[model samples]
Target: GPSFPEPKVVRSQGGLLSLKLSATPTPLAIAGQRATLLTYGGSFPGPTLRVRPRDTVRLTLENRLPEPTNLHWHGLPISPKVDDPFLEIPPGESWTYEFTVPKELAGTFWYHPHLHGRVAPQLFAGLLGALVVESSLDAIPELREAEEHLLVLKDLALQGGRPAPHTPMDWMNGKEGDLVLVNGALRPTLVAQKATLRLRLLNASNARYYRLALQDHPLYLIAADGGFLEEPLEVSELLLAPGERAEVLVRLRKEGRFLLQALPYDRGAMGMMDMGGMAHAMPQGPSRPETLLYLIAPKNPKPLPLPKALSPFPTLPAPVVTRRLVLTEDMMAARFFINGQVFDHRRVDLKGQAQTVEVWEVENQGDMDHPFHLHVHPFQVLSVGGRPFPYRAWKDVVNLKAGEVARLLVPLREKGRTVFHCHIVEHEDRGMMGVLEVG
Candidate 1:
């Protein structure tokens, strides 16, 4: 099959988006054979849907795969309902999502299949995409060049370089793999035109969190899950988890080859080390860090100066209310949860006030590490262990190191409610899911 043309500027008044949920062989070569795998839209990292705010968008979540599935507009505040329950689409059915863009959503959002039991395998195989909402409020209009293309990074493990067996246990305990992918292609060279390009990065992995950085320059994180950041976070590395997306303006002021990395095992030193979480406990072999994408800098020629300043995100007024969730592990079941409640697929947790701020303190009471993720809104990582995380960046996913506390300031304005939970696929399915409802 011929590949579809790259997405052009979407300036039309009416917006229509089509996505297919299907599984097929991964385009990975193992022993010279194409590795078989399941995927959404016939490609890993799915497809990128670019639209502007205030546009009425329609999406048909066509499920052609075997399991029941649903699509969640992560970070887009949506109305919660039994029919279109935030994070759920039934299998063997097509869900038509109709909504007008919110006046305030201005940043990089994302969409993915959110069926618990089957989510780990399908998403692991490939079922993720980035949803970028454009608004002049938080705009950088001049970052366009072949070198400034969008980079979607992820990792996969190959069995003969093909998809492997996903047992109930594998889904119960988040499974990590051995291959890296950028925009669904394995270690493909990402080309950018000269000038600085706006790279909207999505960590679409089921269980892994990526620590991202460029070789010589600091990545400018201008926007996070909710929208624009209060200010640009000049950092050499940004850590992200499943269902999290960040819009960063990278200045490729020069041309070069930069390796993008997600050395989970290297960062493993910072988080609590649980022997149970390792594939092999107490092994004496050198552990090599995983690389998710390779960024091939622009071939030079054009000169685009970096933005002197960017727009500011709205300050989360104050927490109208507060909630406390302790991350606890269920060893016998190999699942983790908040406090004591597991994700009950049929229930909605919080009915909310639109445009309000909700504060959640994620405390780690478990032995293993966990990445807490919220859908439908971006958040400010206010503090860790009761101390302000001065290195604040806009985000929807933040890691809760074992025995640490992560406080998030979430805006509840997106029209509909979306789900928030642990990004570890297996943990989510086994009972780590939670519900948040927006008016």
Candidate 2:
């Protein structure tokens, strides 16, 4: 069931743009189930924003809801004052966001509410949107000529008549929705002629992980979180956690319905609350195959050539400081913490100097995996679980599995008070975050 119809695409014109957005509550039907949800511009998944790299954007977010909320420019390395996640826009008020898109950023990004306690519920109630930065469209002839589409991946849980209720277990292992949606539709289809198409994907779910693939087709990944990869890498499947984005190019020549599927992913035994370690002994549910989208190729469609080069991977700066962070959760206490302490807005846990590089080692001591996200800057993953990362790309969210550790090289160029935490909105809202200041 879909609360709203097919999402409408909104593109920005010229290098200068302005927008006035309102967050309002509305009644909608999802697969015959009715629920009152919060949305931007009256749409479940707000309109898509397409802007060029280095373009200046002027946006006004008007809060019409009953509570305070703030917008976070996910994956974009903007300043912390107005564009980051820490600026709270109170109810019945408006906030203007004016910032320049990073000159080098050119891929898929997104926006969502980031208030400490309200992120999960607000996002699950349908408050997310896609932000695409254009640079490859014209630079790469293949991408420029091909049909382009943006796909947003989100999930929703339904009860007898409304969104599912949150349980203690749900908090411990992040809630995984029963129904999955791609661009606000269940099993949606996209029509294409014999042509190469560029698809920008963003995972907007509150916590679900998407191990996505195309049936009998090659998915060439050209971009990661911040922007394009050095070149297209053919991958069997792409994994996207909440707040992650990827861009891929596909060639469709034959006429038929090609199913895009999300295969089930297992993250070991730490997916729930357990003291005796018996949680892993429970019977597992059938990992049903879910159809996310269908790519329909037209008869006698013509295919275009692929791009030989996508983008360059920027060099990482040498680290001047190194710090360690541990993620943990207490099942009996029903609480989560970073470095053994809960989040305190007034407490600054980490500090950095502007224009310096820092090496961060993040460890997950609890059960389940947590995708860590930092605001205002993109990070480079150096290693995961003591092994070197296979590829190079800038990322804002990095996945740390239970009992696993990750080493990241973060560039601290912006001076402000920002935060980094588990991208799983619920876990972040609960207390798995810390304040970071760069001066």
Candidate 3:
């Protein structure tokens, strides 16, 4: 059984915080096998960084690996010049990232390497961390009294001693691991009171989607990718794509044992099985109904009261401009493209006015689903497949099914050129991306 290894949380000092992280190869035992993997701060999943809203974060990253690397704060709405993923640091070099945590930002975010073609390889080896932006919501008695847990869900394809090299097929269909690890361990057990407990779940896999469900339990959805939802939703299962995060409130009704299972997800083409002339869906490769973790509750548990209301998610202003973007792929060429063109740093795909709202219509014409993500600013999903979302969700990454069309309302507040692409690092590296100029 895996034990809970609480990541060391770093806090800001005098409203300014500094983190010295070095990406290097470190020796470790993964799932009981001896392995040497790349890591940040020499830890499997790196450290958990805690910062207050409006705090300034300065990270001094030292690249000790033989290849180049850069950091991407998954869901932060900061300026591109400060937290740019395109800014690469060569081997034996150090780079500094200074960005302000917006006062409105407070949620479960993450940081990982986004070094173009090497992103999948680097991230699969390790090089990922959890980032939490604290806000006044923490003062609420329900969240304050509950035993809060940060669950970092990730998977990797391991060979003899290193990560299995990705192949063309792997790129066409996202790579998924045979075994999933929770908090850097396999089948970890977490002890909680038979009361309301807050679970912050983050899917950090390079390409896996997790249909997470608690056996014999209800998951109260409190927050989505960007932040708190308008109201908590009681759900039987939560679907989390790569780079997506969800904060849920679960109540333990009685003293017993429960399991967190990653139910099978039909990842469209990848999980489709050919049976005669019909397509039979198969379980997500290697992501079948597997037990991720166990939740144990004690007798006479003092349950905390659920809050009547949670943080409010504001509605966005009307868009001043509308744009259309399309995702396409050529299997023969093994190439992916945005609007029929590959990613070029010199090319500016779309231009928008700063401090204004723009509605983007993104259509997926490819065979597989794509988790579309934009840098610097988060967007609200207006509709998917011509159907309006039940409620608006502020997200940096939005999952698009094949032939699905989605409308997004984005706030173009940051001034500069940034990129938007598939959250699957492999797909992004292959060229399913484009640059946006906000002025």
- Among the numbered candidates, top lDDT falls to 3
Candidate 1: which stretches are off by over 4 Å? 1-33, 82-91, 137-147, 160-162, 167-169, 253-255, 264-287, 296-303, 346-355, 390-394, 414-418, 437-439
Q: Which stretches of candidate 2 lie over 4 Å from their true place?
A: 1-6, 32-34, 268-287, 300-302
TM-score head-to-head 1 vs 3, winner = 3
The TM-scores of all predictions, comma-separated, are: 0.82, 0.92, 0.94
- What's every prediction's RMSD, in angstroms? 4.6, 3.1, 2.8
Task: Name the best candidate (by TM-score).
Answer: 3
Q: Which digits, one per residue and each the tens of the lDDT, describe model 2 over residues 79-158?
A: 88866666788899999889888777788898899898888888887888878787844566777787777788999887
**Model 1 residue 300 lDDT score:** 68
Model 3, 182-290: lDDT tens per residue?
Answer: 8778788888744778888888998888889998888888888878877778899988988999899988878888999989776653445787998754544344687
Clashing pairs in 3: none
Error of 3 at 318 (Å): 1.6
Q: Which stretches of candidate 3 lie over 4 Å from their true place?
A: 269-287
